[model samples]
Target: HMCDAFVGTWKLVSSENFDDYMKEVGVGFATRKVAGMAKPNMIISVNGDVITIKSESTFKNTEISFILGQEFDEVTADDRKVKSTITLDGGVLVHVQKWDGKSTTIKRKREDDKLVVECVMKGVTSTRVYERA
Candidate 1:
């Protein structure tokens, strides 16, 4: 099913539990602490074959654009890593290169009146489900 409510800008209301998600990405204590406390702003725009997600916060700002089912280059918003390509497999967005060899994948979907965000990397995976504020 297609969701129209996900087509606009959504501000960071709050994260239900993002600590483990960050941990899975190999995000260190200091970074995780700051990120966990941060109110992350997210914007999603979708138009045939392309979906762009922009996440902004006091600690970081990142813009990721990808063509549906295609691989494209991704640059870190934290400014700590080089650019890498990201691809989607079975509705899961995966980045094969990031953070000095630490690869990560972010799988997302909107279900039951909430947006589900999942990140996996370095043997760790976390999911944060958010509702409209």
Candidate 2:
């Protein structure tokens, strides 16, 4: 249902519950300190079989791209280590991230007026809601 709606370029207005998610991933204190202070700008561009995400802030910027259904390495000097694979699950984009010797799954969708993202790590799940700018 959301498959077609989510394909495009979007700017992230803000992230709700990101701090908790970052903590779950074991982000360092210094990074977390700056993260909350710094406003994160995220852009996601989707193309056929590939998706690119750019997360930017005054303190740091990171860009990542990967093909659908394939794994790729991702290392955030910020302290979140992950190797991820993305796939479409019933019109929703699903990301499987391997980090800290554990695997996590994230579900993403574009809702009527916002972006809904949910992450599950070690049975602990959190949802982040975002609006477009």
Candidate 3:
């Protein structure tokens, strides 16, 4: 029931190295500034073979839907079109995205009362902590 464990709402608590990660991913300075000011809310849902994750914030909102282990196309918050895949590794949800020869990996795992999301791009890593809401 590891997938079942992630079906809930979460509020972003703290983030580390997010600015550097965004810079590595080519996000502009203004965009990064607005993004840094955002208080994001994440909503995750799983039904049968499909999973959906919605990220909401004052600056931007994005929703992604996919089947575990299946490849899908996605338009990211920064307007980058990419092919992405989701997989489960032990208790973690692993997401990989590739666009224009660049790649990013994101891992989400439950830790006590929080969901920890780690994002890596171009060797830069960012950790975002989310509390159950």
Candidate 4:
């Protein structure tokens, strides 16, 4: 049931404090400008033990694939190469990424028909809400 909840496309509805968060993550100005103007869509799928999350936008497209608790190399949308791991806890999907000795954590959970994502890095946090599309 939890996997079923995550297996769909979601359209970004709202984002809060993303610019500051991006800055904290060291995204460049021009890229951040384009990212700020883009509304990304998330597509998630689960197959047996493997999960894939795809982020689609006019500015960029990024896909990350992994299994629960398994570490893999991931290239983020901002082109950061990070070691990433994903886990599911209490109906929430959590992803932790580390790169250049810095770390970021993202949590995704479903509320009603919406998906809520929380991103945190260096004490700066941002929330992004997505509706099932």
Runs off by more than 4 Å, candidate 4:
none
lDDT of 1 by residue, 72-119 (tens): 566664345654565555544555555566667666666676677776
Model 4 accuracy (lDDT, Cα): 0.92
What RMSD does each model have against the real structure? Answer: 3.3, 2.7, 0.9, 0.9
Q: Candidate 2: which stretches are off by over 4 Å?
A: 1-4, 8-16
Please write out the lDDT profile of model 3 over residues 8-81, one tens digit for every residue: 99999999999999999999999999998887999999878889999999989999999989999998887889
Clashing pairs in 3: none
Expressed as tens digits, the lDDT of each residue in 15-129 for candidate 2 is 6666777677777778777876765556777676567877777878888888878889986647566898888877788989787687878898878878777877665677766
Model 3, global lDDT: 0.93
TM-score of each: 0.70, 0.78, 0.97, 0.96
Per-residue lDDT of model 4, residues 2-43, tens digit only: 478889999999999999999999999998999988888999
Question: Model 3: how far is 120 from its true place, Å?
Answer: 0.5
Please give the lDDT score at residue 46 for candidate 2: 66
State in Å the error of residue 28, model 4. Answer: 1.2
